[PDB]
Amino acid sequence: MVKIRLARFGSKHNPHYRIVVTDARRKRDGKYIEKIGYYDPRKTTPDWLKVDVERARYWLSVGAQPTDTARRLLRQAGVFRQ
Amino acid sequence: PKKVLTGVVVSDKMQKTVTVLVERQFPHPLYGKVIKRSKKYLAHDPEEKYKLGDVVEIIESRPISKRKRFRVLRLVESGRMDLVEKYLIRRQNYESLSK
Amino acid sequence: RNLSALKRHRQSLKRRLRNKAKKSAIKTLSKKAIQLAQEGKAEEALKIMRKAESLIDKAAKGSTLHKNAAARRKSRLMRKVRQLLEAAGAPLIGGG
Amino acid sequence: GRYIGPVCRLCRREGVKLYLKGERCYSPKCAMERRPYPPGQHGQKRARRPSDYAVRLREKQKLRRIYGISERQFRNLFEEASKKKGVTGSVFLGLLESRLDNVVYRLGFAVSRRQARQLVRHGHITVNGRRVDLPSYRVRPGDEIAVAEKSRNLELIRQNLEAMKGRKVGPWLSLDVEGMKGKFLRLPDREDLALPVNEQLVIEFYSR
Amino acid sequence: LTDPIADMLTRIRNATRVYKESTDVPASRFKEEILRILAREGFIKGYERVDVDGKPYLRVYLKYGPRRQGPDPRPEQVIHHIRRISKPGRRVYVGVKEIPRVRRGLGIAILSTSKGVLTDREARKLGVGGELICEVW
Amino acid sequence: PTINQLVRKGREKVRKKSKVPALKGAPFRRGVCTVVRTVTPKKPNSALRKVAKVRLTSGYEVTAYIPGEGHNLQEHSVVLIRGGRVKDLPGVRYHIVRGVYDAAGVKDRKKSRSKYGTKKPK
RNA sequence: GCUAAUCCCCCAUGUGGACCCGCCCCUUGGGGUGUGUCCAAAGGGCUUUGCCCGCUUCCGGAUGGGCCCGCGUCCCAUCAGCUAGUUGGUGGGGUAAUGGCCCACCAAGGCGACGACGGGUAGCCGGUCUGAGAGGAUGGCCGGCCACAGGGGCACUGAGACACGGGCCCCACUCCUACGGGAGGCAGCAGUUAGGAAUCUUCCGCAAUGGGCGCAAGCCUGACGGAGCGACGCCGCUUGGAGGAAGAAGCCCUUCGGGGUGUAAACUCCUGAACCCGGGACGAAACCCCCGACGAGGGGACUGACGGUACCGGGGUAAUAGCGCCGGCCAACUCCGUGCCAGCAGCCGCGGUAAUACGGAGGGCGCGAGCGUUACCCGGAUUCACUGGGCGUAAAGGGCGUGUAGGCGGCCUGGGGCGUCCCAUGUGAAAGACCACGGCUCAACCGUGGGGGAGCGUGGGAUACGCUCAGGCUAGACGG
RNA sequence: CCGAGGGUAGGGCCCGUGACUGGGGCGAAGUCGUAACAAGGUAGCUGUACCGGAAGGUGCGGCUGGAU
Ligand code: SF4
Ligand SMILES: [Mg+2]
Ligand SMILES: [Mg+2]
Ligand SMILES: [Mg+2]
Ligand SMILES: [Mg+2]
Ligand SMILES: [Mg+2]
Ligand SMILES: [Mg+2]
Ligand SMILES: [Mg+2]
Ligand SMILES: [Mg+2]
Ligand SMILES: [Mg+2]
Ligand SMILES: [Mg+2]
Ligand SMILES: [Mg+2]
Ligand SMILES: [Mg+2]
Ligand SMILES: [Mg+2]
Ligand SMILES: [Mg+2]
Ligand SMILES: [Mg+2]
Ligand SMILES: [Mg+2]
Ligand SMILES: [Mg+2]
Ligand SMILES: [Mg+2]
Ligand SMILES: [Mg+2]
Ligand SMILES: [Mg+2]
Ligand SMILES: [Mg+2]
Ligand SMILES: [Mg+2]
Ligand SMILES: [Mg+2]
Ligand SMILES: [Mg+2]
Ligand SMILES: [Mg+2]
Ligand SMILES: [Mg+2]
Ligand SMILES: [Mg+2]
Ligand SMILES: [Mg+2]
Ligand SMILES: [Mg+2]
Ligand SMILES: [Mg+2]
Ligand SMILES: [Mg+2]
Ligand SMILES: [Mg+2]
Ligand SMILES: [Mg+2]
Ligand SMILES: [Mg+2]
Ligand SMILES: [Mg+2]
Ligand SMILES: [Mg+2]
Ligand SMILES: [Mg+2]
Ligand SMILES: [Mg+2]
Ligand SMILES: [Mg+2]
Ligand SMILES: [Mg+2]
Ligand SMILES: [Mg+2]
Ligand SMILES: [Mg+2]
Ligand SMILES: [Mg+2]
Ligand SMILES: [Mg+2]
Ligand SMILES: [Mg+2]
Ligand SMILES: [Mg+2]
Ligand SMILES: [Mg+2]
Ligand SMILES: [Mg+2]
Ligand SMILES: [Mg+2]
Ligand SMILES: [Mg+2]
Ligand SMILES: [Mg+2]
Ligand SMILES: [Mg+2]
Ligand SMILES: [Mg+2]
Ligand SMILES: [Mg+2]
Ligand SMILES: [Mg+2]
Ligand SMILES: [Mg+2]
Ligand SMILES: [Mg+2]
Ligand SMILES: [Mg+2]
Ligand SMILES: [Mg+2]
Ligand SMILES: [Mg+2]
Ligand SMILES: [Mg+2]
Ligand SMILES: [Mg+2]
Ligand SMILES: [Mg+2]
Ligand SMILES: [Mg+2]
Ligand SMILES: [Mg+2]
Ligand SMILES: [Mg+2]
Ligand SMILES: [Mg+2]
Ligand SMILES: [Mg+2]
Ligand SMILES: [Mg+2]
Ligand SMILES: [Mg+2]
Ligand SMILES: [Mg+2]
Ligand SMILES: [Mg+2]
Ligand SMILES: [Mg+2]
Ligand SMILES: [Mg+2]
Ligand SMILES: [Mg+2]
Ligand SMILES: [Mg+2]
Ligand SMILES: [Mg+2]
Ligand SMILES: [Mg+2]
Ligand SMILES: [Mg+2]
Ligand SMILES: [Mg+2]
Ligand SMILES: [Mg+2]
Ligand SMILES: [Mg+2]
Ligand SMILES: [Mg+2]
Ligand SMILES: [Mg+2]
Ligand SMILES: [Mg+2]
Ligand SMILES: [Mg+2]
Ligand SMILES: [Mg+2]
Ligand SMILES: [Mg+2]
Ligand SMILES: [Mg+2]
Ligand SMILES: [Mg+2]
Ligand SMILES: [Mg+2]
Ligand SMILES: [Mg+2]
Ligand SMILES: [Mg+2]
Ligand SMILES: [Mg+2]
Ligand SMILES: [Mg+2]
Ligand SMILES: [Mg+2]
Ligand SMILES: [Mg+2]
Ligand SMILES: [Mg+2]
Ligand SMILES: [Mg+2]
Ligand SMILES: [Mg+2]
Ligand SMILES: [Mg+2]
Ligand SMILES: [Mg+2]
Ligand SMILES: [Mg+2]
Ligand SMILES: [Mg+2]
Ligand SMILES: [Mg+2]
Ligand SMILES: [Mg+2]
Ligand SMILES: [Mg+2]
Ligand SMILES: [Mg+2]
Ligand SMILES: [Mg+2]
Ligand SMILES: [Mg+2]
Ligand SMILES: [Mg+2]
Ligand SMILES: [Mg+2]
Ligand SMILES: [Mg+2]
Ligand SMILES: [Mg+2]
Ligand SMILES: [Mg+2]
Known part of the structure; x- marks a missing residue:
């Protein structure tokens, strides 16, 4: 199944994720279908999170399944707010 | 789209199959000169209606045999036994290239 | 030294028999319908051909046949039975 | 790390006062005032015409020893300035x-x-x-x-x-x-910093 | 004769090097357009369609600099350099983005485009490439 | 050549012949001495140069120079070798590394100790 | 021998789907319809005439694949001829599906100097190193694809495998054994051994991210997140700062007057790497639970391997420097010792009693937790020359014709628009590279944003040049 | 039926090695003569042929890159 998840980039003790859609059988940091945001768990920048909701809601439409702490961050951007 | 090539029929000694010599040009990727290159395609002639010396068009096609991935699309010109001889003269010269 | 792989193997052997048994029966009745139709005997040919068709689609219910594979056997079966009876005629029952 | 040994010998070798000590650099017991010739056994012997390689090496060693910077960091800064669009001489001193x-x-x-x-x-x-x-x-x-x-x-x-x-x-x-x-305020100029150095000769030393 | 375009450029070069006032090249429409560029840019005084023993020619009128002083009075050439680029044995075509600047602007590259024969400046102002015929300065 | 000849034939890239075949792609090769003797040099030099014939692990037997004043190498001495000829002993293409395996460093050496494999003295 | 089920089977139902034949549309097997024939199923748990987890048939989506095609992809022609499932046809078998993929028959074909066949070498690419560019070299780490899982063959199960830690068989090898017989497959993580010039801990944790299963709690995860060792690479940092004599001693040189090491040391003040004590993270808030409605939304909670680590605060000791080189190229010179010896050497060359070239010393130059050496790649090498070379005597015109293929080709007109040129558009993944900003105190490293390119697909346009087709010409060529 | 492979037989290519043998490169401190460079003491070189301890000689034809 297609999934929306966090491909870790960055470096050691400095994680920087790309909120991303890819086949679940890929490896974590492998070729993704498309990128739809980034995430900085350390909050050390004036926008440690971003989400293209126009696309993030499309992938939910065609049935992508968000990870748990991906949905938690897709929530903080309001993809679910009705 | 399906690839379409033009060339002359150089043999038709096969049942429902003709051999289309196809030519092309391009600049040599280091010495610039425009050079010629040719290649033969085994073409599906399901009506045995194309003849030696005909110039035809072939279109990339669902595989027919082992070496057959092109059917003949349409006739372009007939009676080109001048081109067919250039191909044959060369092949004949090969015997003079042995030991 | 062990695995749930052992479990997976014991199951493949049980499934192996069910698949082979079904395909055995399908093959037999397919040529039986074909052979009957050759000397057709149209009522008896189509009679069996209906039973071959049921076993085919029953095979493609589960993991024994694929849709297109079952559909393919059916086609060539009916194609062979009709064009055999049509050498003498004429088909009593259906189909079709 | 950085250079630690005698620093007056540096000036005496470069033939120019490099103000590397602070206030003794202005006293009359500055070594350049007392012995303005290179250090070592042959300091007072008549110099030979230096090669163009010599000339360019010296100007570069001057500019470097002035900042007490390693050749490694010195060369990386020069290579940064060299890629940078604009005159490399200015940017080099600016980064320094x-x-x-x-x-x-x-x-x-x-x-x-x-x-x-x-x-x-x-x-x-x-x-x-x-x-x-x-x-x-x-x-x-x-x-x-x-x-x-x-x-x-x-x-x-x-x-x-x-x-x-x-x-x-x-x-x-x-x-x-x-x-x-x-x-x-802003990064300075060749005019602002009158260094006893033709920095163009350092471009040439590294182009060899 | 395998290359009339390079033969003409060579007819001009041999003539200018011994300070002749004119020389005759056998005529052709593609040559006229080439000479049309050399006169309009001042590498030649011009030309005229003349006739040598009943054959259609082009008489090209050369121009040189002022007489010089010293041991060598020979005046400086106006066409210092002219050579064929694209040749029968190797065609040379550039796109508009890869047209060259002869001699840092002070020279002309003559091109054959599908808007006719142009200079490197003309071809860049019309946004077209073509066959790089030769270069002059 | 014409441009057509270059389309027909191309330009020949010429490979570089190694001057150290016995190393077989390695920076060094371990070996065992067979003959340990002195050889005289070519004109215009005169000397008794110290050489060892080495039977290598790469499957080669080669002559290698022994640098420095004095050594301790004998038949069955285990040595390491590196590239480098002796302009002046034809056939000698390699050098024994002092201070490795059974090659002792140069005794009493003071300048250039990393070559000649001599520890810093107190 | 007994028995359960979401296990297997049978019957019904046929929304629908499958197949045959007919017809319509279409155009390779795409869609539609008519008769016949054929095919569905599985329940479980709660807060129980309602929910949730499941199950069945069908259409569609999305994602991931299979197959096919154009073009590109190394060395040897001292490999020049190769080919019987070979090339095509018909029919069948087989598959998810095209195909000699497999089989039977029929025909005599297929391929090659535009290099078949054979031999050698190699996983390929994004990229990487170099280079002014062109080019050359390379494909380790990360990303993508491919291939393999001791050597072979094989199928089974399955949506998917001909399956690294699944099965069968053969072989090589090893082990266990009670001697009757059995077992094994680290090119997973560590680790051992062998080989080698040479390459790591039998570490910690699922806290994060990700995967499988599960309604959920949660379980499993040598993926992974981290810690360990190696100067292996790059980056950052220290071994102190200031003052301090016409200038100690020691050592070196000396014309014996003196010169050098050298503000260097000593000494004085000042700072305070390390170490001590106190505090101490970010990475972690979702899943969950409460209200709402199990949604939207809002509340509440558990949880950190690294780690008592970074980092903060307070205290606080002057606290490792080494390596190469100094004839020329190439930056740095003297004394002794040696005397074609011992030795140096990248090339040219040094050494035979006054050696800036050997060996030490003093001094100097260059770098610095590095400095040298060896190996290999690109550069200098326009020294394989496309950019960008040559062949009278330096290496280089075939002994001379004739002529095959090929390469190349005069003047004018028109048609086509193949090359060629322009515009639009799709593709050109991510990382990297590049410019900018930002985050780790800087940097390295890393994050965010920006700019395109060739090349190829498609659409539209141009016609000078080359090409092609047609017509005409006589200056080339050929005949009288 | 096909079939891993095993067996029998006969071919092709490549590598390592071999009594002995052929010449080659280098060494240099030897023995023999002195063929070439001067008209190099017989102008030289050359294809071929025959011959000689050796450099080389001679025949035949060719070249001038031969002094006077
Ligand atoms: S005292 Fe003079 S010689 Fe010494 S460091 Fe100061 S300026 Fe340089
Ligand atoms: Mg076929
Ligand atoms: Mg299980
Ligand atoms: Mg039976
Ligand atoms: Mg099925
Ligand atoms: Mg199956
Ligand atoms: Mg100052
Ligand atoms: Mg610049
Ligand atoms: Mg000022
Ligand atoms: Mg200043
Ligand atoms: Mg440079
Ligand atoms: Mg050119
Ligand atoms: Mg000597
Ligand atoms: Mg050995
Ligand atoms: Mg011993
Ligand atoms: Mg040294
Ligand atoms: Mg030395
Ligand atoms: Mg039923
Ligand atoms: Mg078929
Ligand atoms: Mg399959
Ligand atoms: Mg085949
Ligand atoms: Mg057959
Ligand atoms: Mg036959
Ligand atoms: Mg071809
Ligand atoms: Mg070839
Ligand atoms: Mg191999
Ligand atoms: Mg290999
Ligand atoms: Mg270059
Ligand atoms: Mg490679
Ligand atoms: Mg590698
Ligand atoms: Mg990789
Ligand atoms: Mg295998
Ligand atoms: Mg295997
Ligand atoms: Mg193994
Ligand atoms: Mg095996
Ligand atoms: Mg496989
Ligand atoms: Mg596996
Ligand atoms: Mg394993
Ligand atoms: Mg297996
Ligand atoms: Mg056991
Ligand atoms: Mg045991
Ligand atoms: Mg027993
Ligand atoms: Mg058994
Ligand atoms: Mg084990
Ligand atoms: Mg291992
Ligand atoms: Mg290990
Ligand atoms: Mg070992
Ligand atoms: Mg070993
Ligand atoms: Mg590790
Ligand atoms: Mg986990
Ligand atoms: Mg999880
Ligand atoms: Mg679940
Ligand atoms: Mg449980
Ligand atoms: Mg487990
Ligand atoms: Mg573990
Ligand atoms: Mg790790
Ligand atoms: Mg750490
Ligand atoms: Mg380190
Ligand atoms: Mg003094
Ligand atoms: Mg003193
Ligand atoms: Mg003194
Ligand atoms: Mg001090
Ligand atoms: Mg204090
Ligand atoms: Mg935290
Ligand atoms: Mg909530
Ligand atoms: Mg948990
Ligand atoms: Mg603490
Ligand atoms: Mg403190
Ligand atoms: Mg303090
Ligand atoms: Mg001190
Ligand atoms: Mg050095
Ligand atoms: Mg000398
Ligand atoms: Mg140097
Ligand atoms: Mg010097
Ligand atoms: Mg002695
Ligand atoms: Mg002497
Ligand atoms: Mg002496
Ligand atoms: Mg030296
Ligand atoms: Mg010395
Ligand atoms: Mg460092
Ligand atoms: Mg190093
Ligand atoms: Mg090189
Ligand atoms: Mg080159
Ligand atoms: Mg060239
Ligand atoms: Mg040359
Ligand atoms: Mg010659
Ligand atoms: Mg000739
Ligand atoms: Mg001949
Ligand atoms: Mg033409
Ligand atoms: Mg032509
Ligand atoms: Mg036209
Ligand atoms: Mg035309
Ligand atoms: Mg066109
Ligand atoms: Mg594009
Ligand atoms: Mg990119
Ligand atoms: Mg910053
Ligand atoms: Mg970026
Ligand atoms: Mg670019
Ligand atoms: Mg186009
Ligand atoms: Mg005509
Ligand atoms: Mg004529
Ligand atoms: Mg005539
Ligand atoms: Mg067999
Ligand atoms: Mg066999
Ligand atoms: Mg067997
Ligand atoms: Mg011998
Ligand atoms: Mg003679
Ligand atoms: Mg003589
Ligand atoms: Mg003579
Ligand atoms: Mg003779
Ligand atoms: Mg004899
Ligand atoms: Mg004799
Ligand atoms: Mg005689
Ligand atoms: Mg003669
Ligand atoms: Mg003659
Ligand atoms: Mg002469």
């Missing part, structure tokens, strides 16, 4: 002067860049309120280099700042004395 340990010396917090480095390395310096103990920091325009207030009651830094009272700094700088803080 933008080093924290250099600015601290320019502000008169220390008599010598060596002293500045032991100041910076000992955290006795801050940049925009952030304590920074790194000599290599590239100070940018609009910054602010103060004394660590938890060090402002220190003899050496006070006596130094006393002699800076009303003293001019480069145009590209400004020193709030009494408050022990300075400001980096």
